[PDB]
Amino acid sequence: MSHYKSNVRDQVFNLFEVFGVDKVLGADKFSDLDADTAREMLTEIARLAEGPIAESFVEGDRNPPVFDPETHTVTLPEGFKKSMRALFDGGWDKVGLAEHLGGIPMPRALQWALIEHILGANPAAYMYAMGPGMSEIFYNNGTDEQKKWATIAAERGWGATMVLTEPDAGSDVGAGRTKAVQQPDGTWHIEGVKRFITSADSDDLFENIMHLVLARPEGAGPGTKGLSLFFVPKFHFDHETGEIGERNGVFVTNVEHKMGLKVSATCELSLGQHGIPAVGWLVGEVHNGIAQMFDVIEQARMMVGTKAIATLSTGYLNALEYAKERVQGADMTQMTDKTAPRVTITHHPDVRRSLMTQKAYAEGLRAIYLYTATFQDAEVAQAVHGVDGDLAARVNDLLLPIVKGFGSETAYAKLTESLQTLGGSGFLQDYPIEQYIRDSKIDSLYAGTTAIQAQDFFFRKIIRDKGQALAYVAGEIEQFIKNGRLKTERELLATALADVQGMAASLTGYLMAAQEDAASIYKVGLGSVRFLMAVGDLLSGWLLARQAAVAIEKLDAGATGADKSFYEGKIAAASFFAKNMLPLLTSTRQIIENLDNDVMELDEAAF
Amino acid sequence: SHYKSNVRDQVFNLFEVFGVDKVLGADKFSDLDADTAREMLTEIARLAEGPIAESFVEGDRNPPVFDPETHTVTLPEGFKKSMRALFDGGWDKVGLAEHLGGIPMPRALQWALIEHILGANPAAYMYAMGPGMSEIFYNNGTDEQKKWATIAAERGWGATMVLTEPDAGSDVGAGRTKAVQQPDGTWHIEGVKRFITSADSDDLFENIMHLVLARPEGAGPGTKGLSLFFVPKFHFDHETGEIGERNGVFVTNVEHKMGLKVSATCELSLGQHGIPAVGWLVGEVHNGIAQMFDVIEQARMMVGTKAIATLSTGYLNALEYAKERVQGADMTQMTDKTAPRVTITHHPDVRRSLMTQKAYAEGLRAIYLYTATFQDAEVAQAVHGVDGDLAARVNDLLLPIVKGFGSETAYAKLTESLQTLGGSGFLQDYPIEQYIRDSKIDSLYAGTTAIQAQDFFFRKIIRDKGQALAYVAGEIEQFIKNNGRLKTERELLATALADVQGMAASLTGYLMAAQEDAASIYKVGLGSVRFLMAVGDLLSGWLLARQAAVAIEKLDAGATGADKSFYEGKIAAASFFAKNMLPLLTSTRQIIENLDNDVMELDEAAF
Numbered sequence A: 001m002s003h004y005k006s007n008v009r010d011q012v013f014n015l016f017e018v019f020g021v022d023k024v025l026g027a028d029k030f031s032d033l034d035a036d037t038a039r040e041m042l043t044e045i046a047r048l049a050e051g052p053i054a055e056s057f058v059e060g061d062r063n064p065p066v067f068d069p070e071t072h073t074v075t076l077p078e079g080f081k082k083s084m085r086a087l088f089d090g091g092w093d094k095v096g097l098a099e100h101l102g103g104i105p106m107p108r109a110l111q112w113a114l115i116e117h118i119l120g121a122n123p124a125a126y127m128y129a130m131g132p133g134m135s136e137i138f139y140n141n142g143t144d145e146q147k148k149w150a151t152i153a154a155e156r157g158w159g160a161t162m163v164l165t166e167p168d169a170g171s172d173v174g175a176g177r178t179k180a181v182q183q184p185d186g187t188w189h190i191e192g193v194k195r196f197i198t199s200a201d202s203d204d205l206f207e208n209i210m211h212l213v214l215a216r217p218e219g220a221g222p223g224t225k226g227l228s229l230f231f232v233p234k235f236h237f238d239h240e241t242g243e244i245g246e247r248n249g250v251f252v253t254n255v256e257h258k259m260g261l262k263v264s265a266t267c268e269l270s271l272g273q274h275g276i277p278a279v280g281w282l283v284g285e286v287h288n289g290i291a292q293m294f295d296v297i298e299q300a301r302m303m304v305g306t307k308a309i310a311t312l313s314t315g316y317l318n319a320l321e322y323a324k325e326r327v328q329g330a331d332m333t334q335m336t337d338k339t340a341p342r343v344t345i346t347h348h349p350d351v352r353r354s355l356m357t358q359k360a361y362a363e364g365l366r367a368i369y370l371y372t373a374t375f376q377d378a379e380v381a382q383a384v385h386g387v388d389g390d391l392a393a394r395v396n397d398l399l400l401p402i403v404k405g406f407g408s409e410t411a412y413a414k415l416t417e418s419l420q421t422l423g424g425s426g427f428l429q430d431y432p433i434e435q436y437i438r439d440s441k442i443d444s445l446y447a448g449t450t451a452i453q454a455q456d457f458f459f460r461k462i463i464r465d466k467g468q469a470l471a472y473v474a475g476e477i478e479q480f481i482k483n484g485r486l487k488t489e490r491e492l493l494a495t496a497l498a499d500v501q502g503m504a505a506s507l508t509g510y511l512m513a514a515q516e517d518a519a520s521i522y523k524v525g526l527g528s529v530r531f532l533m534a535v536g537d538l539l540s541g542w543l544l545a546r547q548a549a550v551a552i553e554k555l556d557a558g559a560t561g562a563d564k565s566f567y568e569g570k571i572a573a574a575s576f577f578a579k580n581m582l583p584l585l586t587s588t589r590q591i592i593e594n595l596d597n598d599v600m601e602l603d604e605a606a607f
Numbered sequence B: 001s002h003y004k005s006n007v008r009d010q011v012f013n014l015f016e017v018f019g020v021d022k023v024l025g026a027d028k029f030s031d032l033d034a035d036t037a038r039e040m041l042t043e044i045a046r047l048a049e050g051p052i053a054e055s056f057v058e059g060d061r062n063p064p065v066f067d068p069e070t071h072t073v074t075l076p077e078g079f080k081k082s083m084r085a086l087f088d089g090g091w092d093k094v095g096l097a098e099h100l101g102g103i104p105m106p107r108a109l110q111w112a113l114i115e116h117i118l119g120a121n122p123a124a125y126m127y128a129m130g131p132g133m134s135e136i137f138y139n140n141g142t143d144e145q146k147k148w149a150t151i152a153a154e155r156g157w158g159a160t161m162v163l164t165e166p167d168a169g170s171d172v173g174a175g176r177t178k179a180v181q182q183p184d185g186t187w188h189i190e191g192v193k194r195f196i197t198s199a200d201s202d203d204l205f206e207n208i209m210h211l212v213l214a215r216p217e218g219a220g221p222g223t224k225g226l227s228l229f230f231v232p233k234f235h236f237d238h239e240t241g242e243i244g245e246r247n248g249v250f251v252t253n254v255e256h257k258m259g260l261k262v263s264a265t266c267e268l269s270l271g272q273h274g275i276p277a278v279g280w281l282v283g284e285v286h287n288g289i290a291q292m293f294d295v296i297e298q299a300r301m302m303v304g305t306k307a308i309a310t311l312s313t314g315y316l317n318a319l320e321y322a323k324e325r326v327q328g329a330d331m332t333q334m335t336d337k338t339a340p341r342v343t344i345t346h347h348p349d350v351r352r353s354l355m356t357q358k359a360y361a362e363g364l365r366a367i368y369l370y371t372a373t374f375q376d377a378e379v380a381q382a383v384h385g386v387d388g389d390l391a392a393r394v395n396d397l398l399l400p401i402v403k404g405f406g407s408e409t410a411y412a413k414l415t416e417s418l419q420t421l422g423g424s425g426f427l428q429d430y431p432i433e434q435y436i437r438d439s440k441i442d443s444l445y446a447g448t449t450a451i452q453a454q455d456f457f458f459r460k461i462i463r464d465k466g467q468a469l470a471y472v473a474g475e476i477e478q479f480i481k482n483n484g485r486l487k488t489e490r491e492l493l494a495t496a497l498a499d500v501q502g503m504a505a506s507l508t509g510y511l512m513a514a515q516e517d518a519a520s521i522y523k524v525g526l527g528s529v530r531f532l533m534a535v536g537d538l539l540s541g542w543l544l545a546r547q548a549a550v551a552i553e554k555l556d557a558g559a560t561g562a563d564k565s566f567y568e569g570k571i572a573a574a575s576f577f578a579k580n581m582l583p584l585l586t587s588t589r590q591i592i593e594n595l596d597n598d599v600m601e602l603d604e605a606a607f
């Protein structure tokens, strides 16, 4: 069929057999959504993704968007706009939207499992469809008058953008210089140039676009604390009826030529530089921009991580389907017999190693993002984990840089195995894996680079958190370890947990010693990404082992057929991951315990 | 001007580390002195940075176009202009035998010259491999064929190596292309080959020599049944070289690839269009796979050198960017939002990234130059004291490291180069995303990584009775045993050497056990690629530490200015690599000692 190979079976296994999200379906906020309906929804969007959404995956890359300087707009290929219409006509741009905005209430864990299919089939389509979800964030942060506009925006299906980055302010958001000047009538004129804005124009997909723009009010202080957030629509509109009016002064000036994700128009966006003002409205009529915008950034980070996992998963399943059919070579037990029967390449040890590496990381990463999503609803976290609202929020905050940072790095790296499995044919555009790789490279960059994820994770989600979220997670791992068929896995998991605990202690030592020896802090920066990755590997190993424990129970109860094969695969993946990935964490701990500042003291001219 | 060269590091290796200048001016190199060698390096580096690199982008953005009715390819004009610059300077005859018009030189100098073309526009070197392939044909040919080879080299004919078929890629012995003997002693070749690099090349050359593997009718199966045939694109006058009637060998497709787009990669039909593909049996003997491996060995050396050349220019591009990009405050002032902004080389993670890129690019450069010092009997005797037989076995041992470890390592570390640019790294405006796409092929053609690692263990270690490996290990041991300023590095290397020796013993143990239980051989297959990569890391760490020892001597003697910075960087790279890369080999050794056949016994349905 299409390039996109979905895995609803593994999602449902996670949601129901492992995490128990069906326990909240039919109760309270989710009163009107039962387990059967959730399963039917996953299967339906999976078919939508495999069908009309994936249909234009190739076309969007080979026939990419075009910037028109005559009109300061972008044109999109027709096949991709047809996919977008299939998304909208199904109501899938309102997934997890609040009920009062027209949404269907559902757990976030189910919401992200549905979105995974769009991100695997054509991820730019989800990104253009994030409008209603950003209208809800504007709603939540807006005044009572502004809530009227956000309602109109969600119901009319307007596109939306998040507008932070500038040529000199990317990782350092607080260096932004885009200015806001208050007008007599209480509106603001926004002046500046922003860069790398996703969906900054989107052809004729929508009747309006809501730009959510960070800018510095005249006279405000420096840094992120001086930034405010503004509602800047593409077109002015009647604040009561929604009728579209005159063009507002916010114009795309260029579309970037990118390695991949080409059908997502990434634009330079000029505010008030083309002869008419860019009118903006202060969100919430309060000056609190970076806090307001981080509601958007957290959702973007969850999306990027789920996108990376979705893409590895279809890369893996493409590579597996190819390997089952490709005949090449004799069995290794007959390698000296030049007349031995030829075999399919799943018989070769390096190919099985490659495939099990792909499988274990794809399924480990799916479990991580779904686990993370179970802390995103207070009700779900209470029902399935027994944790209250405050702890759930901190655990979610701890896990987000894992989903994003560890997810984005891992998926791109393991797609290398997916392509390798095809041999020379993996280098061809005829197969989708090389586009997967190119489309995935961006995941380690936007919504914050990997280094910024790792820094947030250690400084903010652990040190500032006083270790409460991390201690909670480590305690759940310890409980699994303490508890026969998984004795070896639990022993390897205990070594990996202690390794992560040693890393956290060394890094905390380097940070605390910085009070008296300032340069000590550099060793924290030197170790931070390796630490983030180690925690991801530990979490992957633990959740796979938990899945294997469930699979053992289902096999013992008499699973047969396709169920039995699925469950046997979980036991094999958990055991492979514990024996081949986890032990490397011991060497990484010892490396982190011996970090020094030599590389920091070296003259720049010696590189 | 994407290409950034590093002649200084090449000369450091050639003259200060390995002493290749000891043979310059003596014996085979009596008319090439060290001053001339250095001038050639500067000359081709300048040509590479200018006219060759000039069409690097053009070749990818405006790629070759196939006419299926003429069976020819059109190359973009800028790329052919770059090719003519290469020809006009004699750079398709680097290292060519003197009697064919070449300049005699050590292979180590020859590959250092070629590195620049491969960094600037690697497909240009690949199109220019004709005269080197003519020399192989000369070496394997009859007296009469030697006359044709001389013509082809003098006239600069292009050439191809023609092995692969849809069903015979890694399993070369499965090829079905046929050879039908004619009464006059020529052969008619009949079949369809695929993925053939340069099988047409527009009007670059007046002829192409296709070197084609085919199975004489009635010959046995496997590679042993194959013969090698000289199959010219055009018939020609065997006395004068005058081009004659078109021979029956026609391109019937050109692949759409992830990268290396300007290298036409062709389906090649022999005897399918009503015109015989006349072939001449090479050397008039039936010995095809052994003759073709002369070609395959040069191709594997080229691919490895290509990967390293590309990582080197990716690193230097990233370093130059990081030197100029201002972003964020120093980590010692991260809480102070009025602190001065700093260039990103001040950040710990960026220094970690850049030193990771530096150490791997420079360790890899040392590996291929080290390898090349064993490719001439006279160099191996003069610089290492080893006789010709051992030199050949050591070169044989190191080739899969150059190819397999070079290709895997360069692609993976270019991820760090791209990351250093931030979001800009995802733009086609900078060359790193094309470096990545162009590099992905390196783990696939001239034999996949898995085939490299299987060759490395079974043929270059086991069949060699360990003699080459024992020689290399003994040199590493001698370095470790010999200032105490590299004490920590030598301890770390001693651990890494014992780790690699332990890996080799475990895998050898599994092979011995397969005498009793055939399936034990699968453990060799499971561990073979990780073993090959471990030996690569070990060699990188040792050779960098050797470079550091030389650099310490040069600093002690009183180096100043740019020299001093260069040498300081060598010490820092060797120390960083020993402390951050080498220790992981301990965990990999433990992982290899515990491999099992669970993943081989798993039902294929469970994946």
Ligand SMILES: Cc1cc2nc3c(=O)[nH]c(=O)nc-3n(C[C@H](O)[C@H](O)[C@H](O)COP(=O)(O)OP(=O)(O)OC[C@H]3O[C@@H](n4cnc5c(N)ncnc54)[C@H](O)[C@@H]3O)c2cc1C
Pocket (backbone or CB within 6 Å): A326, A328, A329, A330, A345, A348, A349, A350, A351, A420, A421, A422, A423, A424, A425, A427, B160, B161, B162, B163, B164, B166, B168, B169, B170, B171, B194, B195, B196, B197, B198, B257, B265, B441, B444, B445, B446, B447, B448, B449, B450, B451
């Ligand atoms: C850009 C490009 C240019 C090329 N140029 C040329 C050229 O000029 N001349 C030429 O002759 N060929 C050329 N090739 C062919 C190239 O060498 C083959 O692609 C390569 O040898 C792999 O063969 P295959 O593609 O059929 O993959 P396969 O052999 O089908 O391999 C598929 C997968 O199975 C694995 N596998 C296969 N057999 C084994 C085994 N016994 N044990 C373990 N794992 C195994 C592989 O490692 C890989 O992961 C080119 C290919 C490309 C992509």
Ligand SMILES: Cc1cc2nc3c(=O)[nH]c(=O)nc-3n(C[C@H](O)[C@H](O)[C@H](O)COP(=O)(O)OP(=O)(O)OC[C@H]3O[C@@H](n4cnc5c(N)ncnc54)[C@H](O)[C@@H]3O)c2cc1C
Pocket (backbone or CB within 6 Å): A162, A163, A164, A165, A167, A169, A170, A171, A172, A195, A196, A197, A198, A199, A258, A266, A442, A445, A446, A447, A448, A449, A450, A451, A452, B325, B327, B328, B329, B344, B347, B348, B349, B350, B419, B420, B421, B422, B423, B424, B426
């Ligand atoms: C495809 C794409 C879409 C995008 N879409 C949007 C969008 O819709 N909205 C939006 O606002 N932005 C968007 N961006 C911008 C994106 O978030 C930035 O590219 C990203 O935050 C990195 O900033 P930069 O590109 O300026 O890199 P830089 O900040 O210049 O980073 C360069 C390098 O320095 C490192 N570095 C920087 N600061 C530090 C530090 N303090 N400590 C350690 N290392 C550091 C980085 O990790 C990186 O390796 C998009 C970018 C891309 C590529």
